[PDB]
Amino acid sequence: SMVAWFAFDPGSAHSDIILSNDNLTVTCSSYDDRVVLGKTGFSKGIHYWELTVDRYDNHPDPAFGVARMDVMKDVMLGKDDKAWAMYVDNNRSWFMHNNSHTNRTEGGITKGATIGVLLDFNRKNLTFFINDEQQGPIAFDNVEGLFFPAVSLNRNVQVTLHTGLPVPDFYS
């Protein structure tokens, strides 16, 4: 297929991660944010996938992005130097990498929201979407090497992974 179909990798997950629904749905047992990765790694081309927010209780900062296979699994994505992510609450997002917060953007998530992640190895960049609108500027501009889709979240969030998608501009 022109699109990639994948699920989360149970072998990538922190022990507190709960995978369900053919490894397409994830939550966590802990108040602490924990990581899971996609099973398919990307190193070239352009790839888009989405997360649907099934549950968003209280005001946590789940994170979405890409990571190396050896990213820290027990902390928010982007606390270490092996993930590039957007974290977002009900109000606003930030981008994070190496414990550096950048490009705060107004607008957040709620139950039913969609988060899109556009990983572009030809432009070496990473762009985020919320509800089919670009969230902030291009987040990062030195994308290279092998990356896996990545999520971090805690017990206040559940998300479902949607793959088999083309790039956001594919139609119309």
Numbering used by the authors: 533 to 704
From the paper:
The tripartite motif (TRIM) proteins form one of the largest subfamilies of RING-type E3 ubiquitin ligases, comprising more than 80 members. TRIM family members typically contain a RING domain usually catalyzing ubiquitin transfer; one or two B-box domains mediating protein–protein interactions; and a large coiled-coil domain region, which is involved in self-association or oligomerization with other TRIM E3-ligase proteins. About two-thirds of human TRIM proteins feature a PRYSPRY domain, also known as the B30.2 domain, in their C-terminal region. All characterized family members shared the same overall PRYSPRY twisted β-sandwich fold consisting of a 7-stranded and a 6-stranded antiparallel β-sheet.
There are significant variations in the length, conformation, and amino acid composition of the loops connecting the β-strands. For example, we observed a unique 11-residue deletion between β-strands 2 and 3 in the phylogenetically more closely related family members TRIM9 and TRIM67. Compared with the recently determined structures of TRIM7 PRYSPRY with a peptide substrate or a peptidomimetic ligand, the putative substrate-binding site in the structure of the two phylogenetically closely related family members TRIM9 and TRIM67 was much shallower. This was largely, but not only, due to a distinct orientation of the β5/β6 loop. In TRIM9, this methionine, Met608, packs against Tyr619 on β-strand 6. The equivalent interacting residues in TRIM67 exemplifying this loop collapse are Met680 and Tyr691. That this was seen in both the TRIM9 and TRIM67 structures suggests it is an intrinsic property of this loop in these two closely related homologs, rather than being induced by crystal packing. In summary, our structural data provide a platform for future drug discovery efforts but, importantly, also hint at significant challenges in developing potent small-molecule binders targeting the canonical binding site, especially in cases of particularly shallow surfaces and those partly or largely occluded by either loop collapse (TRIM9/67) or dimerization (TRIM36).
